[PDB]
């Protein structure tokens, strides 16, 4: 009826079929900044 | 006459109107450092990138006429500039706001020198055999110039 | 248009509450266009990560490539379950195998699936217990600097045990690939 | 238990501009009735065994007291029964990068203690202040960052509680020259600006300021080298 949460799985599973443990999972600013040091 | 609710109880030396209150501290807050003519700034430095790439793609056209002097549309105005276009849509469709810099809001010559130098740095760096980078703009400098002041006066405020 | 020197991040920045970057990795909205927590909007496939061997990876992991021919029922093959071919085996008519190994035949209902495992083959001793059906990796070990005819492995090889017979059973030592999850992360910049 | 700590000078004969009469009735009461009632309040209690100024940041009904007789004790410190007129060293190399002159300084110093309007104290200090509050942290730091500013507070405030360093007190509260003289302040005023300021304990001050400023500097790199680390 309200805040239903399927449209997000759908695009998500649209997107990354496999939604498996992530491996490396980090910030976007922790990232640029091990890109940079 | 009276449209302003506040004018009017400050005029009758009445007491405010009242409000929820909230229950976030004012002393212990992140501080703002986002300046407002930062949108601007940028807006008119990605016109100045387009328009001095694009006279690249036409030297017949950027030839015969000076780069300080430049008129796209005679009648060309801001107001006309603001639409909303969501035909186009890739993924996501949206209302597409449409921003018109003015011609004389331009300073062409700084960015054509500054084209000038960052290719001729490219094709140097290209004969050395590596990709050529550059950190900033002037441009963006000046926009975190703006932040830092802004920042500054929040901090003293 | 384009240019030669495409620096995004130069011409995108970001604000409080709002990221504004310039279209020219790749990124992919909604229909609507709204986002939700824990949204992925850019996806960054790294080619350099890619394998072309049909052996995949499994703080590290190891990879071991393995020749896989998928050929139809009424195909005819030209080699023998559970036999040792060299390089250049003509498995097929016209397919001929691209390492030397142990080949493995696995009939199906309508597929013949013909595996060829690559690597070194040892008659394990009497006292080499190892395990038959759970396969081993073995790392670069570190060997002594005195003894001079001592070859340093430096590549992880992959022991598995092959069992063809009830009485007899061989060791085939695979090769192996590097993997490393903390090692290695390149992306784009976005914002200046 | 903190006691009173008696002044430099001898009280009695210190300076023939305040009244002996009048120097001990306003120091000895008012350290005294301080001390004690701050000695009874935090009798106890965790915050006996502390020094005044974790006291002073901490409190509440412990804050009146102990601020009025740190602010009173620095105040005896800061002045000797003589040597008053100029500065000098690196206080003369501030005063003029950032106040412009001496004579600048001095009649803001006077503005500013005459303006309190009732009771409090006037405040000379170097501002070397870190907020805990979203963005503190200055990008492009630099000189001219840290500066001298004179500051008023109201009754039993001083410039600890804004993580400013103290240099320099004025106490314009009414016991100071009520007693002593007729009661014009800017006499007062210009008699402390002219005949008993002492600007050496103001020198080793603000060596103590830099030299606080400094080793809060250093953590800053320490962090960041940990972080690196
Ligand atoms: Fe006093």
């Keep these: 009826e309200k805040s239903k949460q399927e449209r997000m799985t759908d695009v998500h599973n649209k997107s990354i079929v496999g939604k498996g443990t992530v491996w490396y999972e980090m910030a976007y600013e922790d990232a640029v900044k091990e890109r940079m040091q | 006459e009276d449209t302003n609710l506040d004018e009017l109880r400050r005029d009758c030396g009445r007491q405010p109107l009242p409000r929820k209150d909230p229950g976030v501290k004012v002393e212990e807050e992140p501080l703002l450092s986002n300046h407002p003519y930062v949108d601007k700034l940028w807006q008119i430095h990605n016109a100045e990138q387009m328009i001095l790439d694009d006279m690249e793609a036409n030297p017949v056209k950027y030839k015969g006429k000076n780069l300080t002097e ?9 107001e006309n500039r603001i639409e909303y276009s969501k035909a186009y849509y890739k993924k996501a469709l949206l209302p597409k706001m449409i921003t018109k810099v003015s011609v004389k809001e331009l300073d062409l010559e700084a960015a054509f020198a500054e084209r000038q130098h960052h290719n001729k740095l490219r094709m140097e760096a290209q004969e050395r055999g590596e990709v050529y980078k550059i950190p900033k703009l002037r441009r963006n400098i000046e926009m975190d110039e703006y932040d830092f002041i802004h920042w500054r006066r929040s901090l003293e405020e | 248009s384009p240019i030669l020197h495409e ?4 011409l995108s920045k970001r604000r409080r509450n709002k990221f504004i970057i310039p279209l020219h990795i790749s990124i992919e909205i909604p229909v609507n266009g709204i986002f939700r927590r824990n949204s992925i909007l850019a996806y960054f496939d790294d080619p350099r990560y890619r394998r072309k061997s049909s052996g995949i990876i499994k ?12 050929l139809p029922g009424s195909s005819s093959i030209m080699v023998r379950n559970n036999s040792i071919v060299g390089v250049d085996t003509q498995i097929t008519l016209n397919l001929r195998s691209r ?12 597929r013949i699936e013909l595996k060829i495992f690559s690597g070194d083959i040892h008659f394990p001793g009497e006292t080499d217990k190892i395990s038959r059906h759970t396969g081993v990796l073995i790392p670069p070990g570190t060997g002594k600097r005195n003894s001079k005819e001592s070859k340093k492995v430096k590549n992880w090889i992959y022991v598995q045990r092959i069992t063809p017979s009830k009485k007899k059973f061989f060791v085939l030592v695979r090769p192996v690939v590097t993997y490393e999850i903390t090692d290695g992360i390149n992306l784009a910049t976005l914002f200046p | 238990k903190f006691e009173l700590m008696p002044p430099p000078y001898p009280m009695n004969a210190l300076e023939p501009h305040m009244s002996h009469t009048t120097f001990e009735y306003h120091w000895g009461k008012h350290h005294r009735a301080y001390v004690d009632n701050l000695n009874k309040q935090i009798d106890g209690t965790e915050l006996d065994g502390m020094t005044l100024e974790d006291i002073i940041l901490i409190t509440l009904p412990p804050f009146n007291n102990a601020a009025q007789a740190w602010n009173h004790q620095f105040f005896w410190e800061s002045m000797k029964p003589s040597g008053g007129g100029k500065p000098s060293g690196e206080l003369l190399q501030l005063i003029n990068r950032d106040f412009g002159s001496f004579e600048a300084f001095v009649k803001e110093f006077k503005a500013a203690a005459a303006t309190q309007f009732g009771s409090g104290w006037a405040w000379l ?6 907020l805990n509050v979203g963005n503190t942290s200055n990008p492009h730091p630099t000189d001219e960052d840290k500066k001298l500013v004179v500051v008023k507070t109201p009754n039993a405030v001083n410039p600890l509680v804004w993580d400013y360093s103290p240099l320099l007190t004025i106490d314009v509260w009414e016991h100071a020259y009520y007693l002593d003289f007729r009661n014009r302040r800017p006499d007062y005023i210009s008699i402390f600006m002219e005949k008993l300021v002492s600007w050496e304990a103001v020198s080793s001050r603000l060596e103590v300021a830099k030299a606080k400023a400094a080793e809060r500097e250093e953590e800053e790199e320490r962090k960041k080298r940990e972080k690196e680390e």
């Design chain 2, 70 to 78: 430049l008129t796209d549309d005679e009648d060309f105005d801001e």
């Design chain 3, 7 to 10: 620096n995004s991040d130069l």
């Design chain 3, 59 to 70: 703080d590290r992991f190891f990879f071991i490539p393995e020749e896989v021919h998928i």
């Design chain 3, 99 to 110: 390492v030397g190994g142990l080949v493995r035949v696995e009939r199906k209902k309508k």
């Design chain 4, 125 to 130: 200090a170097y501002k070397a202040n870190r």
